[PDB]
Amino acid sequence: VVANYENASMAADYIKRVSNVLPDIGIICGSGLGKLIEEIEERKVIPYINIPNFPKTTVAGHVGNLVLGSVGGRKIVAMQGRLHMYEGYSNQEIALPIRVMKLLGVRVLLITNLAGGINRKLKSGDFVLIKGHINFPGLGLNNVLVGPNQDEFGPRFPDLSNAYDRLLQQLALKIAQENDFQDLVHEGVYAFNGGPTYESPDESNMLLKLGCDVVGMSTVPEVIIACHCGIKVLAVSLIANNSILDAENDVSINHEKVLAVAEKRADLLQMWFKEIITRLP
Template structure:
């Protein structure tokens, strides 16, 4: 009898702990938390951004293009996570890009850093509360499409959310209608008009030889993919693979913002057991450095076109 009572007490204790943890997790990333952070930022700067830009590994130079900058270290922003990855500066930069008010994340957050998925995507909800209407995301990715070369820029037209297949989705848990609906559509996750605009701008700039389009697959990381995994992902329809972006896209679309995203192909995924090639982070950063100026020019020119396009005014 005593053993049964002890067992029941232990189960109740576990249930209380789990319930408390669940409440704690949901309360840390609430609408009120995001609003408090957005209000704090707006009190520090007069810039009211309509475009939000997220910079991937080695691509933080986009933020340096902003004029009349007001920058904040992530560690100084209430409720904000901190970037722990080499190549991510960890700053939120406000300013104007060719006259358009923008906010730029110079470094992002990933599942492999140990953050809950809701914390990773919290900045995107803050973007929404700052007044952002269009989100532009960049990342460094491994090429799975054999027609891709290192240094190619891939406009993302769709994605495969592998962590989501296992239930790790940033929208898991209670839904707050102030952000968006319970079951948002993702068949139009990447704005088709912005994709076409990128292709047109790329042609104007003479980037036709290295501007591609394709499907991006996200994995949890931080280990790079095995040969078998690369082969499987390619067969599933992925053209490039990485460890970011998709979670942010889901939240941006949930909030009703338009999304454009691109991948810089920084290495070719290894699919041959006889190959001596090995993926490494330094190669990612080096390729980013080499192609960064052209990528920055593409995005900044797009921002100008968005400004003068009535569909996005």
């Protein structure tokens, strides 16, 4: 199924019939960082299997729902169950849910992820507001937009220079200052490692040379589809480790350690994003 105007329209029509919510904010949450979705008020849960043209996710299993409702007096739509390109999903499968958000009325997309620290001053448990990216799949002919252009959504050759909205970064930082955790908050450039292997020690050293602050396996495909169709983005990385220190010390990293960091910062991140939603212009 192609992520075209007709197929996205059929999905949007179904969602509008069953939900009665017109959202202007979309959210996609990282692993272990989804508790905010469980606090959506007056909510409607829509299994992906029920939505015309949504991708099939039963090989990976686990949860897969769209959730619509209210947070802080604002109307939102959340993806509960994220699609990642290292799982083998196609460009068209990743893009269709974001283009459906666009047709439902979404103007702002908020994204979180887990990442490895490259910049030497980043510690486990820090947050990084993403200000730009280095897209190794895109340079290498695996960009999410390779294929025919869907002209109803955006241009053949998009400019990504404003993909990460400056004013949304400024608001996120202001709220951190108001709540006395600004010492945890940095800004930086995100390297997209297609995955699913963690960056090797020598790849980490290369990313340091090339101007990268953090590295991870998600987010950039969604950012590009959003920018192509005019949706503003705020993207925040939670740092699980410093990959450069681990390379210099011959120390390992695993999904388990990553998940313990997520649990340590989950409640803080949930409160931060609830306040960002409440305060968005």
